[PDB]
């Protein structure tokens, strides 16, 4: 499939001080403005030189894994996807397309939702790896209200080993700038990109456009 969703719009890159969590970037994936119909989508690829610091905040999560590689085409690439029940980490010779995303849709006679991964990749020829364990992310808590929870990660690739880190802490101040796991013996990495989750329905009539939609999402990035 691989429908096209990108939009001509571009915005000047914002930046903020790290404040000892620097010249950290700041991106907006789904952006809304006064003109209520302005839904925009853009997930550019970013360099991966030595290491990356990742953080985000979400009301109801739409963030599922990442993709890493050098060519990002059928000509290898590490892929991660995480869902509500279990995480899966796989190394495979995937064939991606310009606008990868994870789609979900209704199932009329089974009274449940289902997720289709074929919107991300087309071919997985002669492919081996697979892993399973408890999920990295989680979207439930014993409290709901004004305060939110903040996530963070660190990736480094030294001596051939691949390693991950993560911590969870809630905020106590009003909304502002940032307050102030496994080891996989996997490849040459120089780029990566995050992938979102989108959902569709048919309740409304005469929707002469693509039905993919979701809420607003943002995240931070930095280098070592």
């Amino acid at each position: 499939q691989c429908v096209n969703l990108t939009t001509r719009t571009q915005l000047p890159p914002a930046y903020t001080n790290s404040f000892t969590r620097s010249n950290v970037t700041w991106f907006h994936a789904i952006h809304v403005s006064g003109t209520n119909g302005t839904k925009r989508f853009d997930n550019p690829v970013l360099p991966f030189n030595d290491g990356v610091y990742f953080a985000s905040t979400e009301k109801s999560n739409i963030i599922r894994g990442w993709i890493f590689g050098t060519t990002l085409d059928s000509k290898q690439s590490l892929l991660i996807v995480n869902n509500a029940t279990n995480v899966v980490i796989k190394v495979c010779e995937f064939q991606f397309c310009n606008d990868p995303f994870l789609g979900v849709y209704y199932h009329k006679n089974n009274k449940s939702w289902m997720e289709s991964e074929f919107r991300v990749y087309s071919s997985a020829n002669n492919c081996t790896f697979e892993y399973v364990s408890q999920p990295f992310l989680m979207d439930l808590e014993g409290k709901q209200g004004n305060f939110k929870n903040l996530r963070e990660f660190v990736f480094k690739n030294i001596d051939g080993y691949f390693k991950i880190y993560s911590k969870h802490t809630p905020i106590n101040l009003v909304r502002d700038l940032p307050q102030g796991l496994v080891d996989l013996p996997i490849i040459n990495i120089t780029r990566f990109q995050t992938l979102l989750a989108l959902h569709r329905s048919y309740l409304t009539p005469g929707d002469s456009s693509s039905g993919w939609t979701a809420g607003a999402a943002a995240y931070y990035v930095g280098y070592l």
Partner: antibody
Amino acid sequence: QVQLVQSGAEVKKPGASVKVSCKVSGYTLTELSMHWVRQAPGKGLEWMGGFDPEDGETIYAQKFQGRVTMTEDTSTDTAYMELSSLRSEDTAVYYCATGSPFDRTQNWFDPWGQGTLVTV
Amino acid sequence: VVTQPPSVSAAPGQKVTISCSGSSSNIGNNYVSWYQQLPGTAPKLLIYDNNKRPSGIPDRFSGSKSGTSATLGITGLQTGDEADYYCGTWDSSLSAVVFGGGTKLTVL
């Protein structure tokens, strides 16, 4: 944007049976309901049957029940319907309609097909 | 079952009202919708939920439900477009979705 296309015209002799096929594109049949409607020349529309979101079944009109049958196949993404015991007065155009798949009990048919004609 | 006055007529630029009626169970405890039938063409939805137009082409229309009667109209009619119009809904008692007889709009 769903676009529907179906089989070309058909002819038949008295007392036989005929089948009509309707196809979809864009969306997939597993998240849409299907209905069938017929109109006699100048006599107005008439409802044949369809899928009821209230429960998982297929219910037919009280008048024609037993003379028809419906089936679906998802691999090719095409819906099928059959008609039998054709009689003297049976002749009309046949339309393939779709609508909301998960409303409690609602009726807003859209879109429709280009139409097929069956002669008896 | 339902009834509807056939073959209404009007002059261009004037108001026009179409009346569709039913019984307590036929049209009372449900919504309605209105379709138009250009000759030699499949119908095209116009109104749903008794007052809500779909996005895009549909022009401004209205509908009120006086218990078991509903009406549709347009402030001004034109010869640019004109065809048959139909009413129909889901009967709630011992019945299924039914359609009315229709009325052949006439423009001088």
